[PDB]
Amino acid sequence: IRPTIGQQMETGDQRFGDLVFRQLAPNVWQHTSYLDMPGFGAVASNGLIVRDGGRVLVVDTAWTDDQTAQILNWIKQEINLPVALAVVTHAHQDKMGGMDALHAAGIATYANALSNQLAPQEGMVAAQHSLTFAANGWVEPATAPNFGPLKVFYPGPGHTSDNITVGIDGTDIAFGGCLIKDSKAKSLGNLGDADTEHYAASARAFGAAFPKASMIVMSHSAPDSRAAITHTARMADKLR
Amino acid sequence: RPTIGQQMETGDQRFGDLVFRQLAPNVWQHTSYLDMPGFGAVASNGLIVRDGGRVLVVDTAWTDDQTAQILNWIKQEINLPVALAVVTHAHQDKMGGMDALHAAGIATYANALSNQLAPQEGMVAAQHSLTFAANGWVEPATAPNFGPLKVFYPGPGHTSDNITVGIDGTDIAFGGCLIKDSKAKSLGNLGDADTEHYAASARAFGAAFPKASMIVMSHSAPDSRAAITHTARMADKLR
Numbered sequence: 001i002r003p004t005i006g007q008q009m010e011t012g013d014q015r016f017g018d019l020v021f022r023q024l025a026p027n028v029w030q031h032t033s034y035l036d037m038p039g040f041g042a043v044a045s046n047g048l049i050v051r052d053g054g055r056v057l058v059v060d061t062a063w064t065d066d067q068t069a070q071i072l073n074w075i076k077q078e079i080n081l082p083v084a085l086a087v088v089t090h091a092h093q094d095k096m097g098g099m100d101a102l103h104a105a106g107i108a109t110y111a112n113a114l115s116n117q118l119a120p121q122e123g124m125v126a127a128q129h130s131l132t133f134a135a136n137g138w139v140e141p142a143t144a145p146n147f148g149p150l151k152v153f154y155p156g157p158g159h160t161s162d163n164i165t166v167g168i169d170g171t172d173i174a175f176g177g178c179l180i181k182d183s184k185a186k187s188l189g190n191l192g193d194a195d196t197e198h199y200a201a202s203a204r205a206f207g208a209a210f211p212k213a214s215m216i217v218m219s220h221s222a223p224d225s226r227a228a229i230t231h232t233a234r235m236a237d238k239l240r
Numbered sequence: 241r242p243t244i245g246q247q248m249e250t251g252d253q254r255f256g257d258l259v260f261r262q263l264a265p266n267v268w269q270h271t272s273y274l275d276m277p278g279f280g281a282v283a284s285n286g287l288i289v290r291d292g293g294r295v296l297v298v299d300t301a302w303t304d305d306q307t308a309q310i311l312n313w314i315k316q317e318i319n320l321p322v323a324l325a326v327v328t329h330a331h332q333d334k335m336g337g338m339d340a341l342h343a344a345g346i347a348t349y350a351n352a353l354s355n356q357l358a359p360q361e362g363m364v365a366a367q368h369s370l371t372f373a374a375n376g377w378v379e380p381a382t383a384p385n386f387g388p389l390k391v392f393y394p395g396p397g398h399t400s401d402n403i404t405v406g407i408d409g410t411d412i413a414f415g416g417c418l419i420k421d422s423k424a425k426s427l428g429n430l431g432d433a434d435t436e437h438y439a440a441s442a443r444a445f446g447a448a449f450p451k452a453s454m455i456v457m458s459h460s461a462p463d464s465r466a467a468i469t470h471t472a473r474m475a476d477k478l479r
């Protein structure tokens with residue numbers, strides 16, 4: 001309803017149980033789930049849902065298994081196609097807290113190899129499959145089969161050392177996950193697992209890997225313009 | 241590098257685990273941080289005011305040890321006695337450090353209601369209770385020798401007991417957790433909030449100190465009066 005961190009509800013948003021869904025393009029929706037800390041309030045976290053042909057691809061879980069099952073129920077009701085796979089963008093609760101729910105549903109899960117290696121140490125269940133990346137950041141094609149329009153890019157360490165990003169070919173949309181903050185943000189969020197030396201280059205690498213995208217989607221704000229990339233990089237420049 | 245709260249900047253002095261910023265010749269902002277695993281540091285701001293040969297404090301830090309650090313900083317940088325502290329409602333970021341003030345012999349004041357809620361909020365009550373008139377102004381007999389501290393209860397908002405403090409002889413007024421900055425996305429923790437009256441209460445604070453141009457608040461750097469108006473606009477949507 002009214003998050004302490006993350007974007008507020010707005011027109012075009014549809015509420016479904018404890019979640020909020022927003023259509024970004026004919027075949028792309030943003031999913032939002034909330035972690036309610038008592039004495040603090042709710043923290044919104046955003047992922048994506050993509051319809052590619054006759055299947056659904058998910059980017060990021062919700063905070064919990066129950067919330068992620070609710071995402072799968074919303075897909076069932078609104079899209080009514082099989083969910084082929086999910087990619088999770090790093091090993092923290094807001095992006096991988098729901099992995100058990102995906103596995104129980106028979107959905108194949110993919111994450112950066114480093115995310116799977118860090119998962120147990122971060123309290124997460126590892127994905128079933130590991131993505132690896134070239135030196136230029138692009139996913140090694142053989143590790144990401146049947147990804148449809150998803151273009152998976154590892155920009156370098158920033159918010160975490162394992163954070164990855166996803167563009168949707170054929171759309172105006174690129175997803176920065178927790179690496180990218182909105183153009184009006186005052187801070188870079190939780191830096192406790194962050195690489196302050198490389199953060200700025202990582203944000204600029206994300207921008208150069210998805211040069212066309214005009215809708216920048218991120219974990220804790222509403223979709224923004226490319227000004228979110230420039231602003232994130234400039235706040236990061238001050239960390240070094 | 242706080243997850244919540246302002247970042248460091250020129251003019252910010254680090255002292256132990258805290259940060260101090262001079263806002264005026266006789267007014268400083270104290271900032272302390274609560275690290276919460278999985279989320280990072282949350283900053284919380286209060287004020288320190290010099291009034292002649294004595295010092296006055298608004299709000300503790302999150303913890304006793306942090307609050308004792310504030311007293312150490314005052315001792316080092318000002319070297320005058322703290323006559324009294326006013327705490328602005330019964331939550332940890334504003335009253336978490338009561339025990340440290342009391343160990344130091346400092347007289348503590350809170351809204352009577354804050355003192356009544358403190359036990360239920362895991363807090364230690366101030367030793368003196370402020371009471372308020374029907375228009376929100378503190379009853380002067382309950383705020384003796386407050387010097388420039390002009391205490392105002394704006395109405396329920398962030399909590400039912402939240403109070404605010406204007407600094408007479410300056411253009412500074414302190415909204416505590418009632419007021420969020422002009423660029424804020426949300427009203428923060430609404431769990432204990434009065435959503436029906438929040439908007440009126442924020443505007444009441446602005447009306448009580450109509451000439452204060454620097455608005456200080458618990459979780460953002462000092463701001464303009466657009467902090468007040470934006471906070472009220474957000475609260476209008478709660479009704």
Ligand SMILES: CC1(C)S[C@H]([C@H](NC(=O)COc2cccc3ccccc23)C(=O)O)N[C@H]1C(=O)O
Nearest residue numbers: 037043092093094178188189190243277278279
């Ligand atoms: C600042 C963030 C929005 S919190 C998030 C991530 N946290 C977790 O998934 C774990 O979630 C938590 C656990 C325990 C208490 C919590 C209290 C409040 C909120 C979350 C809590 C993280 O640590 O990076 N990503 C950051 C960011 O994108 O910058």
Ligand SMILES: CC1(C)S[C@H]([C@H](NC(=O)COc2cccc3ccccc23)C(=O)O)N[C@H]1C(=O)O
Nearest residue numbers: 037038039040276282331332333417427428429
């Ligand atoms: C959102 C706030 C900045 S937290 C604050 C107040 N919190 C507490 O003193 C209790 O402390 C906590 C407990 C549990 C988790 C926490 C995580 C992060 C920070 C504090 C936490 C409150 O309850 O209002 N005032 C709010 C606001 O002004 O809007």
Ligand SMILES: [Zn+2]
Nearest residue numbers: 092159160178
């Ligand atoms: Zn994270």
Ligand SMILES: [Zn+2]
Nearest residue numbers: 094178219220
């Ligand atoms: Zn995040």
Ligand SMILES: [Zn+2]
Nearest residue numbers: 331398399417
């Ligand atoms: Zn509070």
Ligand SMILES: [Zn+2]
Nearest residue numbers: 333417458459
């Ligand atoms: Zn607060």
